[PDB]
RNA sequence: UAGAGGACAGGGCCUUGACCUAUUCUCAAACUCCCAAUAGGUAAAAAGGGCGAAAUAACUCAAUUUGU
RNA sequence: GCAGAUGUCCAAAGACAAGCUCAAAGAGAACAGAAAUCUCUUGUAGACUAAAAGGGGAAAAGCUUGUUUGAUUUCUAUUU
RNA sequence: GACUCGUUCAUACUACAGUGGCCACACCAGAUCCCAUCAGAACUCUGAAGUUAAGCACUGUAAGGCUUGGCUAGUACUGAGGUGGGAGACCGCUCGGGAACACCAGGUGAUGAGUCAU
């Protein structure tokens, strides 16, 4: 038989029953498809920083542990 | 002053309204009148015409001299012989309406209009 | 009918002021000044070449929101103190103006010693993009003359070679840069009809430079350029219209 | 039955009266940085990089910048939850948002106020005031303009 | 929907009109110069901001010291 | 529910660049007329843009010309 | 007085007038050369005899347009309340928001960087 085609009735209170949830808004976002030749260079920057920090820490550890 | 009316352009037109042979002959006679090449009309090819300037235009107008109504309100005129003569004459400084860089319009004081066109024709 | 109707004026939308005046293209302009948004603080310098019917102007411009900033400028009338007193609209004059603009820009930036350019005429250098400005880019154009001048001055201005005189003819380019094409015109006019020669190159003779001095004067000009670069308000309007009506009542 | 990309955008995506034509050359000179707020206003003269109908007039942060485009994070309401959407548009359709300009001006002004307040060790209230009830005012008025009002008759 | 004024066509200086100009009565869900109310979006600081120095990069720039 | 449209078409009607400006009206020119071609003036688009309708477009996105095949291979972040 | 590159994109536009020019723009003189066409008209190239006639600048008009303010008008419309009125169509009241056309008046620009001339 003929059926009710459509209605948005009660949909808003259904939505608000568990509230309108907001996005989590994390601090960091994946850089997978973003600005190549920039984030690759950023990887190089981080590697250089880590290498310098690690070599300095290793020097300190060796000179303090004899 | 540099307000004298010179002949800016003289156009000879031959409107046959059909295909070649006669069109080629019309182009040839236009060549003989003016060694410069003619162009043909629409190809919806029906007519041939040419544009001349300077001393050649003046002497061809003199040859065609052989009515004080067929002057246009924009200061141009023409007649017929078969061939149509039409001369568009203007004062100096018409470049400003034709060049690309600072294209603008001349004032109606600088325009030629029909009274000065007729007076120029009578004087010449 | 009238096409200047009140509704026509109501609905009319005006072009930009510069487009109305015919000065700028506003499509070439934004294609020239648009820089990749990744590149922050990328200047994108523009080598503007304009040619009046008396002398040519070359400048270096950087686009800014409040208006362009001009970092260097050179006019062909500056060639008087460099020894070119006549023919300041020439291909050679445009080359010299471009050379002067490039050299003076580099001097302002303190980079002359690091970017010597070229000698005589046959780290990465500064980059600038040529702005033509409404002129049609035919082969053998003074805009490309000035571009070659700046290139020899030491600026890196990208360019092809089809638009130099001859579609490549380095010898023809050299002679046009040195003004030989004007010397040949002087020679042929003098040899054919001296009267037209002296009525055409009138100021050349008054300057006492001949067809054989043009090349040398341009060479030494290049080298010395290189080595040293009222209103009426409503009250008056009402008074004037009142008095005009009073006068008109009797006069007409 | 008809749900194309630009369905229902007859007026939204039309240029204003006497405001037709491409964007100004100065629009290409505006500076965009990562994480700053931006308004998505569709410019119908530029067809590529055109945002979807929904995002016209929305605001979001930059998460990606390309040579002529920008990626902006926009919250869109989908029934029972808000969800983030990464819309990629050309720089003609994006504009530096002023949603936080008052915040930045307040930041700089409050900074230079707090500096001198701490210098003079004066305790100052820095938060915005949401001004409400006005104090009593002992106002003078000559009786030449205290005019009496009566409701008007019908005509 | 009506007249009012004014230099192409028709007949007998005249008329019929057309046309133009300034008006005039009345309208639009698939008309708009203008444009609400309501409704909607973003922002209102600490895992952050501001201000500097030093490091890193294969990125960017004319710049191994421009910028990011 | 209303007015329609689709199962196509295009080596150019795709790409780039350059130059140009369109519809229409008025005036003028042997044949030549309400219309055939040419000239001038005005011309915010009243044209054109494959098709339905709606947006967009004037040194263009329209017209003409030149050179072309980016109507190519691969992969992301994504919008409806 | 000026020019180049811009910004705003009509207070900047349009029509008709008046005034202005030394380097300044420009009109202008030519076509050997690069280049270009039917046409050196345009484009391009080479010039400097002439001219502010025009472009350009400034101003004017009970100018059109544009723009700002007032006024239309707390009108039209509208959010919330009503066991409000009215047979209904519609119309008040309470707590709030608030136009438009038209008409009237003023105005017709301002400005960034650089440069030339005196």
Breaks (C-N over 2.5 A) in chain C follow: 122, 167, 229
How far from chain centre, in Å, is Cα C137? 14
**Distances, alpha carbon C156 to alpha carbons C12, C33, C46, C170, in Å:** 44, 17, 11, 19
Give the residue from B96, B99, B101 with the most C CB atoms within 10 Å of its CB, the best one to mutate. Answer: B101
- The reply to whether A33 has its C-beta less than 7 Å from any atom of strand F is yes
**Residue D49 in tokens:** 């990089």
Distances in whole angstroms, Cα of residue A55 to Cα of each of A45, A58, A61, A64, A65? 16, 5, 10, 14, 15
CA distance C35 to C40: 9
Cα A18 to the chain's mean position, in Å?
25
| D42/D52 Cα distance (integer angstroms) | 9
The CA distance from B49 to B13, in Å, is: 4
Identify whether the C-beta of residue C132 lies closer than 8 Å to the C-beta of residue C49: yes
Cβ-defined contact of D18 to C11 (cutoff 8 Å): yes
Structure tokens at D46: 């530029």
How far is it, in rounded angstroms, from Cα B103 to Cα B93? 12
Spatial neighbors of C224 by CB under 8 A, at least 6 apart, are C82, C83
Question: Edge-to-edge strand order for the sheet containing B84-90?
Answer: B39-40, B47-52, B6-15, B84-90, B76-80
Sign of CA dihedral D71, D72, D73, D76: negative
C181 near C91, Cβ under 8 Å? yes
d(C-alpha C249, C-alpha D6), whole Å: 65
Strand partners, C47: C60, C130
Are the beta carbons of D82 and A22 separated by less than 8 Å? yes
Q: Do B and C touch (≥3 CB pairs < 8 Å)?
A: yes
Q: Which residue of A has its CA nearest to D77?
A: A20
Q: Could you give the 3-state DSSP secondary structure of residue A51?
A: helix
Q: Which residues of D touch C42 (CB under 8 A)?
A: none
Q: What is the CA radius of gyration of chain B?
A: 16
Residues 44-63 of C with CB under 7 A from strand F: none
* Contacting subunits of D (3+ beta carbon pairs below 8 A): A, C
Question: Taking the CB of residue D73, how many other CB atoms lie within 10 A of it?
Answer: 18
Which secondary-structure segment (H or E) carries B10? strand B6-15
Estimate in Å the CA C83 to C1' G49 gap, whole number: 25
- Contact criterion met (CB below 8 Å) for D126 and D110: yes
Q: Which of residues 52-91 of C touch strand G (CB under 7 A)?
A: 52-55, 57, 59, 61, 63-70, 73, 75, 77, 86-87, 89-91
- Strand F near-CB residues (< 7 Å), D 32-71: 44-47, 52, 54, 64, 71
**φ, ψ at C156 (rounded to 5°):** -95, 100
> Which residues of chain C make contact with D20, given a CB cutoff of 8 A?
13
Burial C117-139 (b: 16+ CB within 10 A, else e): beeebeeebbebebbbbeeeeee
- Distance from the Cα of A19 to chain D's closest Cα (Å) equals 7
Question: Does residue B80 approach strand F to less than 7 Å at its CB?
Answer: yes
Distances (CA, A) of C77 to C87, C116, C176, D144: 10, 24, 19, 74
CA dist., res. A65 & res. B115, Å (int): 112
Resolution (A): 2.3
Where are the strands (E) in C102-250, listed by range? 128-131
Q: How far apart are CA C243 and CA C239, in angstroms?
A: 6
Q: Who contacts B111 (Cβ-Cβ below 8 Å, separation ≥6)?
A: B74, B75, B90, B91
The CA distance from C157 to C30, in Å, is 18
A21 DSSP assignment: B
Say yes or no: Cβ of C6 under 7 A from any atom of strand F.
Answer: no
Scanning the structure block, which residue is given the tokens 């303009």?
A: D145
Nucleotides of F under 7 A from a protein CB: 4, 18-20, 25-32, 36-45, 54-61, 76-80
Integer Cα distance of C146 and C150 in angstroms: 6
| Cβ burial, residue C163 (10 Å; 0-12/13-18/19+) | middle
Reported as type and span, the H/E element at residue C47 is strand C45-51
Q: Count of CB contacts below 8 A, B vs C?
A: 11
> Which chain B residues are closer than 8 Å to C23 by Cβ?
102
Protein residue closest via CA to C1' of G64: C6
The secondary structure element, H or E, covering residue C59 is strand C56-62
Contact in structure between D121 and D74 (CB atoms under 8 Å): no
- Asked whether the beta carbons of D80 and A13 are under 8 A apart, the reply is no
The two structure tokens encoding residue B58: 């003046």
Test the B interface: residue of C15, C17, C18, C21 with most B CBs within 10 Å: C21
Tokens 């037109």 belong to which residue?
B13
Does residue C196 contact residue C70 with C-beta atoms inside 8 Å? no
Cα angle: B102, vertex B108, B114; to 5 degrees: 130
Solving technique: cryo-EM
Q: What whole-number distance in Å separates Cα of residue A4 and Cα of residue A25?
A: 40
Give bridge partners of residue B48 from the DSSP assignment.
B14, B40
Which of C25, C37, C69 to probe the D interface (max D CBs under 10 A)?
C37
- Which residues are CB-contacts of B32 (< 8 A; sequence separation ≥ 6)? none
- How far lies B99's CA from each of B94, B103, C135, D128, in Å? 9, 6, 10, 62
CA distance B26 to B39: 11
CA of D4 to C1' of F8 (A): 19
Pick left, alpha or beta for residue B117 (phi over 0 → left; psi -120 to 50 → alpha; otherwise beta): alpha
Chain C neighbors of D70, CB-CB under 8 A:
37
Whole-number Å distance, CA A45 to C1' F48?
Answer: 56
Q: How far apart are CA C153 and CA C99, in angstroms?
A: 5
Q: What number of other Cβ atoms are within 10 A of residue C21's Cβ? A: 13
Looking at residue D15, what DSSP letter applies? P
Q: Using CB atoms within 10 A of its CB, is residue B8 exposed (0-12), middle (13-18) or buried (19+)?
A: middle
Could you write out the three-class secondary structure of C68-116? CEEEEEEEHHHHHCCCCCCCCCCHHHHHHHHHHHHHHHHHHCCCCCCCC
HEC readout, D34-89: CCCEEEECCCCCCCCCCCCHHHCCEEEEEEEECCCEEEEEEEEEECCEEEEEEEEE
């Amino acid at each position: 038989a003929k059926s009710k085609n459509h209605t948005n009735h009660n949909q808003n209170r259904k939505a608000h029953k568990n509230g309108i949830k907001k996005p989590k808004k994390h601090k960091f976002m994946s850089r997978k498809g973003l600005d190549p030749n920039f984030f690759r260079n950023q990887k190089y920057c981080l590697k250089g920083i880590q290498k310098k920090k690690k070599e300095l820490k290793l020097k300190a550890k060796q000179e303090k542990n004899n | 002053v540099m307000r004298e009316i010179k002949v800016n352009k003289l156009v000879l037109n031959i409107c046959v309204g059909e295909s070649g042979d006669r069109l080629t002959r019309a182009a040839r006679v236009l060549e003989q009148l003016t060694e410069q090449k003619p162009i043909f009309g629409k190809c919806r090819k029906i007519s041939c015409f040419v544009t001349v300037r300077g001393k050649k235009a003046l002497e061809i107008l003199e040859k065609g001299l052989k009515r004080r109504k067929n002057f246009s309100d924009t200061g141009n005129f023409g007649f017929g012989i078969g061939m149509d003569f039409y001369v568009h004459l203007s004062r100096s400084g018409y470049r400003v309406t034709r060049r690309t860089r600072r294209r603008s319009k001349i004032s109606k004081t600088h325009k030629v209009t029909k009274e000065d066109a007729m007076k120029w024709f009578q004087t010449k | 009918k009238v096409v200047k109707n009140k509704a026509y004026f109501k609905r009319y939308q005006v072009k930009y002021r510069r487009r109305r005046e015919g000065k700028t293209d506003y499509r070439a302009r934004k294609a020239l000044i648009l820089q990749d948004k990744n590149k922050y603080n990328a200047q994108k310098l523009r080598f503007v070449v304009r040619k009046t019917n008396s002398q040519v102007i070359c400048q270096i411009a950087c686009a800014h929101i409040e208006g362009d900033k001009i970092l260097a400028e050179a006019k062909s009338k500056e060639l008087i103190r460099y020894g070119i007193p006549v023919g300041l609209k020439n291909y050679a004059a445009a080359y010299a103006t471009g050379l002067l603009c490039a050299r003076r820009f580099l001097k302002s930036l303190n980079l002359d010693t690091q970017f010597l350019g070229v000698e005589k005429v046959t780290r990465k250098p500064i980059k600038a993009f040529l702005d033509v400005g409404i002129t049609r880019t035919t082969t053998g154009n003074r805009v490309f003359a000035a571009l070659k001048g700046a290139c020899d001055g030491g600026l890196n201005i990208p360019h092809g070679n089809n638009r130099f005189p001859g579609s490549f003819n380095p010898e023809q380019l050299r002679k046009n840069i040195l003004g030989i094409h004007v010397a040949e015109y002087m020679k042929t006019l003098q040899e054919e009809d001296n009267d037209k020669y002296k009525t055409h190159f009138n100021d050349y003779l008054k300057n006492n430079i001949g067809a054989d001095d043009i090349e040398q004067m341009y060479l030494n000009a290049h080298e010395k350029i290189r080595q040293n670069p009222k209103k009426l308000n409503a009250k008056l309007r009402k008074k004037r219209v009142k008095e005009k009506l009073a006068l008109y009542v009797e006069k007409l | 039955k008809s749900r194309g990309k630009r369905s229902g955008t007859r007026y939204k995506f039309s240029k204003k009266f006497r405001k037709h034509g491409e964007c100004t050359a100065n629009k290409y000179l505006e500076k965009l940085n990562y994480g700053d707020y931006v308004d998505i206003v569709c410019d119908s003269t530029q067809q590529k990089g055109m945002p979807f109908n929904y995002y016209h007039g929305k605001t979001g942060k930059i998460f990606h910048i390309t040579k002529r485009g920008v990626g902006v994070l926009v919250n869109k309401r989908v029934k029972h939850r808000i969800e983030q959407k990464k819309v990629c548009v050309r720089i003609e359709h994006v504009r530096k948002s002023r949603c936080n300009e008052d915040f930045l001006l307040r930041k700089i002004k409050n900074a230079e106020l707090i500096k001198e307040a701490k210098l003079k060790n004066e305790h100052i209230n820095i938060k915005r005031k949401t001004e409400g009830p006005k104090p009593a005012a002992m106002i003078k008025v000559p009786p030449s303009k205290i005019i009496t009002i009566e409701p008007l008759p019908f005509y």
